[PDB]
């Protein structure tokens, strides 16, 4: 889905802008309610679990060379057991923190790459569960 | 997976724990 790639782009842009950066500095039933719920869910999650986002780039030894593997390792583990809306929010915040810090440490190249990995993962492994659960409208309802 | 990726593994496992608790926090 393009709406999914749009969800990723929306969320990352939000997280980036939130720290002074602009998404355009690195890239070439309604969804507005969904984008908003996710944004909020993300802020709350990052707030309640600040520790897991402190020095991610350090906590994982991330470099443009190991970035993908690290990303995939974290995510495969996160969903190893299955899927929840909670894990999905965690999935988004993680990717967001990852981008924001890549930019902070002169690795801006990772931003768009991360978005791609997220969209790909979202579409290939999360989408089925999402739909089976009623689509994103279900999250908007169940969250706040 | 090589040791260089085990940290990412533990991190993912911890992430799951925090999001399961978060999940349990919903309406």
Author numbering:
A (entry chain A): 2 to 29, 81 to 196
B (entry chain B): 95 to 121
Show passages lifted from the paper.
For a detailed structural comparison, we used the crystal structure of BCL-XL in complex with BAD that we have determined to 2.3 Å resolution, in which 27 residues of BAD bound to BCL-XL as an extended α-helix and all the rest of the residues were totally disordered. A sequence alignment based on the structural comparison showed that four out of five residues within proapoptotic BH3 domains that are critical for their interactions with the BH3-binding groove are conserved as Leu110, Leu114, Asp119 and Phe121 in Beclin1. The remaining residue, which is isoleucine or methionine in the BH3 domains, is substituted as Thr117 in Beclin1. These five residues occupy spatially and chemically equivalent positions at the BH3-binding groove of M11 as the corresponding residues of BAD bound to BCL-XL. Another noticeable difference from the canonical BH3 domains is that the Beclin1 α-helix has a hydrophobic patch composed of Val116, Leu120 and Ile123 that are not shielded by the BH3-binding groove, while those of other BH3 domains, including that of BAD, are distinctively amphipathic. The Beclin1 helix has a hydrophobic patch (indicated by an asterisk) on the opposite side of the BH3-binding groove, unlike the BAD helix.
